[PDB]
């Protein structure tokens, strides 16, 4: 009985029932007929980001006017798991589904081009690997950015250095409103890990 | 030099002599002849109770009206005995020394029965094994209670259950005066044993 | 993280360049030529003790009146190693190195003979082991007085017995003038060691 902290750690279970990988795999195929096991398959689905991002026809724009908006919130799962990482690597997909009270007498058709991350629509070319649809005929529009990039990740919001790897750029020829759900590609994932931040509840608007 | 207590007991042995289970042996050829080792062999020596143990002609007496004064004092082996332990079991012996300025022209005779502990004598029968002996040519009534009980082992002051054991009962027919002395039978053991109460010394009765 | 002090002695050593020894080697090739080992063969060094010793003619001088002057000074190797140290034990030597300007029309001669210690010139005879030497053709009168003593070692200031070992006569029929030069001979040395006195720097005589 000697005078000094210590150590010696005492792993103590309750409940002596069963091994509980037997348990989980048992209550799997009663209740799931799932079992998801990485959080890098949830970056493979596609989550709506918006539903309802209006444009007007005959202009070209970023993505980044509309992701840099909902990075933020934390709304999909791409942008919520951000908040556990501090790294990324790989390309990303998109889907554009149509919600537009479209007119006959017109022909609307959907571009999409790259930019580098971060410029403007006047500072870049339209000669590149493109995408067309025609909405009348085939509502959704389906692209994947690759991962061009001149560093093999890339960190959240850095220096000067500017247009280091690439993105999307959208054009329609008529003033079109979307739903955009984003998710990354087979080679997408994140890394370098730290700690959540905090969550955010109810709004009830009290009386007093 | 650390802080804290500690443990690790240090046996030591004074004067280094010879190994002390010869010396007792070596000690006891010469001074004793006799080598006691048990305190149940002391049970079974009859030490005297009483000197002097008046009674009335034709009045049968529980011995419990002797021994229930007698158990208190430790004078003999059984009563001093007892004080170290909290159980008991076995049979008891006695022995009756006669002791009566006795007269010639009577017949003089010493009936010995069964009660059941603690019980008086007017509800009690005399229909058991008896003994009788005859002062004037045998002086000396030896009896022996046996083990007749309802529990394996009888405590000290037990519940309102009486009479779960036997004991002895007395009868003459001339009012006698004796010399008791008791001791167990070859089945009389203490066990459970406890601690030692106090003991007496002088009673001077000094001058102030 | 207990409490109390502890041991375990964690010797380190700078600078891991080459083992010492290999060192120490290679540098007495290159700067001395010579490895003093051992301090008791600087007892075998002859050292001067003083310079300028002035006797009178005809007179029996021991060396005893010089070298109980000299041992406090520890000027030389057997008074200043000899604090160091205890005991001793071994003859001594002796070089008498003529400074005198002498006349030719006498004979000088250095007689040398034997004393017990700490003896006066009186109470001591001339028989015994002797030297002569003559300063006109060798000017170093070399003696060596051996061990002859009661005891296997001898202290520092010892008791009131005194003449238990032997020393050095000196005369001479002129009045001569030397430089003594001692040492030990194959035999002495010191033992039983303690620790150093102290030491004395230089002497300025400051102006205030």
């Given amino acids: 009985i000697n005078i000094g902290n210590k150590t010696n750690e005492n792993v103590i279970s309750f409940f002596d029932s069963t091994d509980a990988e037997t348990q989980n795999h048992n209550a799997l195929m009663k209740g799931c007929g799932e079992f998801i096991v990485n959080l890098r398959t949830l970056l493979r689905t596609f989550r ?62 959907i571009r999409s081009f790259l930019i580098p991350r971060n410029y403007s629509a006047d500072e870049i070319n339209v000669d590149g690997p493109s995408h067309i649809t025609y909405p009348v005929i085939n509502p959704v529009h389906e692209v994947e950015v690759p991962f061009y990039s001149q560093y093999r990740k890339i960190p959240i919001a850095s220096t000067s250095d500017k247009g280091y790897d690439s993105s999307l750029m ?39």
């Fill in 48 to 109: 709506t980001i918006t539903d309802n991002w209006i444009l007007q026809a005959n202009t070209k724009t970023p993505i980044t006017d509309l992701t840099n908006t909902t990075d933020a919130q934390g709304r999909d799962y791409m942008s919520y798991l951000s908040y556990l990482y501090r790294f990324y690597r790989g390309g990303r997909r998109y889907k554009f589904f149509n919600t537009t009270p479209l007119k006959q007498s017109q022909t609307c058709y």
């Fill in 170 to 208: 959208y054009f329609s020829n008529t003033a079109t409103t979307q739903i955009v759900a984003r998710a990354g590609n087979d080679d997408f994932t994140f890394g370098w890990m730290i700690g959540p931040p905090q969550l955010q509840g109810e709004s009830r608007s009290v009386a007093p």
